[PDB]
Structure formats: C-alpha cells, structure tokens
C-alpha cells in the first residue's frame, strides 16, 4: 500500500528510531500496549503503512533492529512502548563493530547479515505494495554503517524497485567524536553514492545550535534531538499517511527533487522551533514559518545555503490553511533571494500540504531543499582522511581487517569526483 519498514543500526540511530516510532505512536494515539485509544479512524485508515495489526489488535511496527551488541536491544527493550514491539526483530550482535567499518562490514559485517536479511525478507512478504523502508545509522563509523552498507547493497539488489531513504549521522567539522571517522565515512560514502536512493544529512552541532539558540535550551542530549529529527522524518510521509489538497510522495519527491541520481544527499528544515515564551511574542502564519524556512540556522546540516546555491528546494506543509497564501510566499521567496536559487531550474521551489498538521500544532512546515553547499563537508572529511592517510594513522587497526588501501583511493577520487561534480552543476548557467 506504499507501506514501509524501518531498519536502524548506529551508535545513536538505534536510539533514534526508538524515539521515532515513539512519536508515530503518539500521532496514532495507540496505547503502549498496542491497541488504539484515539478518536478518529483516520489514524487507523492509513495505520498499516507503518504499523501492523496483530491477532487481537497488537499493533506493531515494521521496524528492523540492527546492532552488534545487545545493550541497545535491552535499552529500547527497556523502552516505554517496549510492549508495543515484536520480540522477533531484536536482531543484534555479540561483539560490536569497534567502529572499524571493515569489522562491521566484513568481519561482523558478513557474520550477522544473513539472519537480518532473512527476517527482513519475511517482512518483505509482509508488505503488499511496499513503497519502501527507512534505514538509519551514522556515516562516520560502523555501529550502523558497518552493516548498513551491506544492507543497502543486499536489499538494493534484492529490491531494485524499492526506495532507500537513508539518514545517517555526519561528523560535524569541529568536534571529532572519533578520528577513524574519515575512513569509515569515506569507505561508506563510496557505497552510499552508488546504492542509496535518498539521503539527508545528520549533524549534531546543528541540533545543538537549534536546541541552544533557537530552542533556547541549555541541556542537550540525544533524545530531544531525535525528537527534533523524527519530527521531520515523521512528517515526511504525512500525505502518504493522510489526505492533502496538495500531495506528493517520496517518488514524487525525489523524482521532483533530484536532477541526476548522485544528488540524494539533502538538507533539512523543520519548524516552528520556540521556547515557551515565544508564542507570547509571536503567532503562526504560513509567511512566518516561511520566514523560518530559509533560515541557515534551521539549515540543520554542515552546508550553508548562504554560501552554496539552492539546486532544489521544497516545503512540506501539514495543517489547514490557504494555499493561496502558500504558493504566494513560495514564489515570493523564490524571487527574494533568487541568487541562491540555481538558474535553469525554473520554479526550483515546489509545494505540498497535508490536511492535518502534526499533533499539538496547527500548521506544519518542512524543508528538504538541496543546494550544493555540502562540498565543504566532503572536502573537510576527505581532507582529514587525506592527512592521516598520508600518515596511515590507525591503518593498523584498519589493514588488520584485511581491506586494501586502493579501496580508500576508490572512495577517495570517487568522493572528490562527486564534489567537483557538484561544482560544475553549481558553476553553470
């Protein structure tokens, strides 16, 4: 039915989806136990395309658990809504990748892929007209990417028609949570540029910036952050989940978002984002949220539209309004800062609306535009990879996995090729 599935690895991402399904449960108001306690059939109408009824009305996720060590499995296993799960999917590891990506990709990569792809495949038979599935990990290591690389390869072959919308955490330029990041990252991204269908960037520092400045929060954790992102990743299917006077699916999205298949790394904007007092400063209009939409500070990725140029831009609106406003602000904005709008893409802004906003708010905005400002991102990470690969720093942890360096060259001149590729598209008219 255009239903989809979720698969998460990732040192964080395993938590991320926990929050995610948590949020969707709220938007479906079904008890933690797994039965519905809401007030409209509309939550039940399209419930299946994420959930699954069970005998007795156990309502369940179409999620897939990735992990190389059960702790997360216990963690979310210790999770509220944990009784809303299926024990089947608790597919984890006994070792952990140690985030040498070769470890999580050959060593443990080849070790535990099979049981996953089997049960996942059983989910594939459980899906009537599968629009797709949602993967989640991080692009700097192996706790997610280790195996998730193998996932994208295997299912991608196994389902060359299905959509692969991939969110994985990008290392911020400043803070290096690990120094093996350039290598895991580069080795992964070689794969992901080939095999993944959609990708959107996952920085932490942006999420900090949001929580601290625009959220005006002092105490950052993951969980709030995954609230902030699963807000958007939860919004994305809204029309696909719920009616909309102007609907567009991921196929309409990506096909209406990408000129050439190498450009499915997208940046993200969601809003509104206030602290409590703000409403008693300000109110909500479509033009208002628009005035956030093109905010670099909501630009939750390491790329700057202020520095790069919008190759593409789009808006995901959930609520009840007048599109006569919506479009009007659209075109207005597409003029107002025309210069950061790439040229030969006429009407490079594109529209949407969901008859219902997310719960709690009256109107919704989402922006997954695609400039080319990410070039500094790949340039950076490739740069650090370059330095220590001059040094071969921690190659020994690496070659101990029994990869070659020439692969590193492959993702290397590879990833540079993708960058310059974005250069010419940005530098053209």
């Amino acid at each position: 039915m255009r239903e989809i599935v979720h698969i998460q690895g990732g040192q964080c991402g395993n938590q991320i989806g926990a929050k995610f399904w948590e949020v969707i449960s709220d938007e479906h108001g079904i008890d933690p136990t797994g039965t519905y306690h809401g007030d409209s059939d509309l939550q039940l109408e399209r419930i299946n395309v994420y959930y699954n009824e069970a005998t007795g009305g156990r309502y369940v996720p179409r999620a897939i658990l990735m992990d190389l060590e059960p702790g997360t499995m216990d963690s979310v296993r210790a999770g509220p809504f944990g009784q809303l799960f299926r024990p089947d999917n608790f597919v984890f590891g006994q070792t952990g990748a140690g985030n040498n990506w070769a470890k999580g990709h050959y060593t443990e990569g080849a070790e535990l892929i099979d049981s996953v792809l089997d049960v996942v495949r059983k989910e594939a038979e459980g899906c009537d007209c599968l629009q797709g599935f949602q993967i989640t990990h991080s692009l700097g290591g192996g706790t997610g990417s280790g195996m998730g690389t193998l996932l994208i390869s295997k299912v991608r072959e196994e389902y060359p028609d299905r959509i692969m919308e991939t969110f994985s955490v990008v290392p911020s330029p400043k803070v290096s949570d690990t120094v093996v990041e350039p290598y895991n990252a580069t080795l992964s991204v070689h794969q992901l540029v080939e095999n993944a269908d959609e990708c959107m960037v996952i920085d932490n520092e942006a999420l900090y910036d949001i929580c601290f400045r625009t959220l005006k929060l002092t105490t950052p954790t993951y969980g709030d952050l995954n609230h902030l992102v699963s807000a958007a990743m939860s919004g994305v299917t809204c029309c696909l989940r719920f009616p909309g006077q102007l609907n567009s699916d991921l196929r309409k999205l990506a096909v209406n978002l990408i000129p050439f298949p190498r450009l499915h790394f997208f940046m993200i904007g969601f809003a509104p984002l206030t602290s409590r007092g703000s409403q008693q400063y300000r109110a909500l209009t479509v033009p208002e949220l628009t005035q956030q939409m093109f905010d670099a500070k909501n630009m939750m990725c390491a790329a700057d539209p202020r520095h790069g140029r919008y190759l593409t831009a789009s808006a995901l609106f959930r609520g009840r309004m007048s599109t006569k406003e919506v479009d009007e602000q659209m075109l207005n904005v597409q003029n107002k800062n025309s210069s950061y709008f790439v040229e030969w893409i006429p009407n490079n802004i594109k529209s949407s609306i969901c008859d219902i906003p997310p719960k709690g708010l009256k109107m919704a905005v989402t922006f997954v535009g695609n400039s080319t400002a990410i070039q500094e991102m790949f340039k950076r990470v490739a740069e650090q990879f370059t330095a220590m690969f001059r040094r071969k720093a921690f190659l020994h942890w690496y070659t101990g996995e029994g990869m070659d360096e020439m692969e590193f060259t492959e993702a290397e001149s590879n990833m540079n090729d993708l960058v310059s590729e974005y250069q010419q598209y940005q530098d053209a008219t």
Partner: protein
Amino acid sequence: MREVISIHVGQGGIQVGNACWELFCLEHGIQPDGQMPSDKTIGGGDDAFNTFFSETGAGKHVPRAVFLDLEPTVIDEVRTGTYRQLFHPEQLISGKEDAANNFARGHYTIGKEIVDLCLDRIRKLADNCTGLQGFLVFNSVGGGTGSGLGSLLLERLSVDYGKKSKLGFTIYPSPQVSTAVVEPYNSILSTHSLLEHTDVAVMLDNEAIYDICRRNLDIERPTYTNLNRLIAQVISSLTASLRFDGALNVDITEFQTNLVPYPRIHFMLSSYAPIISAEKAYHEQLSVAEITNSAFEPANMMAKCDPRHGKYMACSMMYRGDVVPKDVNASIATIKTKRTIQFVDWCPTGFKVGINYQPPTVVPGGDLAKVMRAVCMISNSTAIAEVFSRLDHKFDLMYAKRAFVHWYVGEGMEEGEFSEAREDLAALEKDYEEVGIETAE
C-alpha cells in the same frame, strides 16, 4: 556476554587487585561473603555484575580474576582477610620462592613452575565465560614475578586465545623514586618481551600518586592503601560502559587500534580526577569544565612524564554521571583551543567520547571526596619516550659495567637478550622519534 577477567602479580600489583575487587564489590554492593544484601530482580537490556562477579546457585558471586605470584606471603592475607568468603580457593595460585627480582627467575627459572596451573585456571574461567572481550592483567616491574612470570604469561596466553583484548595495568619505575636498582633489568628485559605480547597498556607511576594525593586529596602521609585506592578508581571507570548505561558505551576493542593508531607505540597516560577533599568538595562546584580543563593539567598528569613536552594523539575522556554531550563537546573545542598542546597532526582529531550516566561512588574510609562526574583521560602523546630514554641510559651504563649480570646469567638468559633488548628500546625510540615527525609538505 561482555566479560573481562583480572590477573594479579607482583607485590604492589596484587595490592592493586585487592583494592580493586574491594572496590567493585563495594560498588555493586554485594556483600563480602558473596551475597548481595537482597534478592536480584529479573530484568533485561544490559548485563550487570555478571561480567566479573560470578553467579552461583545462591548468594555466592565471586570475581572473574586470578592471582598469580611467586611471593605467596601477602596473598595469604587475602587468604585470611575478610573476603575469605568472597574469593575462591582455586582462584588462588601463588609461588613460594619468588623471583628475588630476577626477571630471569620467575620468568625462566621459576617461570617453568606454575604456568600450567595458571593456564588451566584460565581455561576454567574463559570456558566459564562466553563473551569475554579481553584480559585484565596486573603486575609490576618490582615484585619480580610481576615482570618475569607475567612476561611468559602474556607470552603464551596471547598465543592461546589471541582474539581477546590485552588490558595492561603494570607499574613503571618512578623517575627518581624507585624500589631497587635492577629495575633496568626487570623493565627492559620485560619490554622487548612485553611489546609483541602486549596489545595495549598504561603506565602508572607512584610519585604522581603521592604528589597529587597530597595536594589534591590533601594527603599528608600516603601509602599503597591510597595508591591502590586511586588506581581502584581509575580502573573503576575505565570499564563502566560494560557495566552501566552511558550515552556512548565505548569498548576496549573499540579503543584498541583507534587510540593507538599505529601498532607499535601502544601505551598511554591516565589522569583521573576529580580527586578532592570533603573541605574542597565544599568550597567548590567541580564543573564539567573544571574536570575537563583540569583534565589536561600537566601537573595533574598521573604519570611523571610532561605532556607539554609531548604531542597528544588521542584522548578518551569517558565520563561518569551527569554529563552533557554539548558541554563536554565545547570543552573539547577548548582542547583544540589549547595553544600549548600539539597533536599528531596526521591524526588531527581522534577523540572518542564517553558519557556514562552513573556518577562516581566513593569508598568509605577513603580520602577522595564525592562528586557528580568523572573523567578518564586515557591519552597518548609523544612525551613518554623520554623517561624510557632515562631507563635505557641508566640501564645502559649499569649494564655496561656488567653490574648484577651474574645474577641473571646464572639463571639462564643470554647477553644478546640484553644488548638486543636495548636495540628494542632503540627501535621504540625510533618510533616515538618518527611518529612525532610531522608528515612533510
């Protein structure tokens, strides 16, 4: 599922071990006999004690660690001590006549005497265990078996399993303070036979323990009780991830080829804090930034080798308690900020966060005050080669004078072991010499 096991050797070494298992048993609060004060509820999500404290069919939960040393007096004190309900007889293997600090004796001479018993015990535990990640081995370049017999120990244990991690806690000859003079012999003879049988290990020196406990713990007159307590804390936190929920429950194997990027120079420093008094617990606040900026005080450096004379490579500031990713994170920016510090630039950043949510527990009768947040700066730099150089120069001359050599030649070692082992520190001097070279252009 996630096991480790501790090995204990040398007088100071098993002193450390005693402090440690006192500690952990305190920290899970399982009573010294082997029972917990109360029943254990059935739950899931992560392991517990099961790592180390050994489940029985009843309130008997013994460590997963082993004693081995050829100087069996003191260990008997454990054989007598309060935890004589705690430990287990077959947990105990000792030698009667120790090495006399002949490396070559308990390594060669008495090296032959207890090995098989050791390996059988190891097989009993690892066979008892499932997902034992790595090996906690403790010894000392002083209590002589701590050098010699341990040297054979890893020398063979590595060849037994291999795939386990080597968790190395041994003590290093204090720079000017000491215990003997054959220490050169113990150390370097250990070292050339240490390295290729070691995965990674840290070097704890005492004089720092003194100076810092006396200033930072406000200690007037310390000893191995305080020392063993302090290392008790540091190991107490170096493995919390496998014991307690933390945001980034990093792991040893994870640490291995990432902290020590190359294979060779795979040791490090470790300055834990916050060690303060009850009168500094109050009159203070002990910020994340205070532990953090304080974490890199060279004068806080818990092994007498100046960091400021070296260039850092990695820093795994695993944290206990109420830690914020952001706050620490910006502190790490602050660490990038430190002009005086200089990093193996070809490893620009190699950082690796640790935010475990349990703040520290304190041992009654101790001198450390209670806090909310712990740091372990397991960091690796260029600096530490120098004191080695002192070791090989001291040993250089003394060996040149053939001092004591009769003792060792009497027990079955050859001279080329000596000069060649000096070639060993020659090479490692080339290693700290070279890796510190900044890659050209």
